[PDB]
Amino acid sequence: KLPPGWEKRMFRSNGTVYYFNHITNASQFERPSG
Numbered sequence: 001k002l003p004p005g006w007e008k009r010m011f012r013s014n015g016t017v018y019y020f021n022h023i024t025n026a027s028q029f030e031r032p033s034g
């Protein structure tokens with residue numbers, strides 16, 4: 001869906017999950033894959 005560089009990421013201290021683009025530095029909660 002969204003580009004290569006997005007990867008799954010997790011908020012320590014509450015356990016929430018999101019995605020992070022380690023190629024651009026962006027963050028989004030909807031998943032470019034799943």
Ligand SMILES: *[C@@H]1O[C@H](CO)[C@@H](O)[C@H](O)[C@H]1NC(C)=O
Nearest residue numbers: 010011012013014015016017
């Ligand atoms: C969990 O913490 C992050 C920041 O660490 C925050 O952005 C996120 O909204 C929190 N989870 C929920 C369900 O709000």
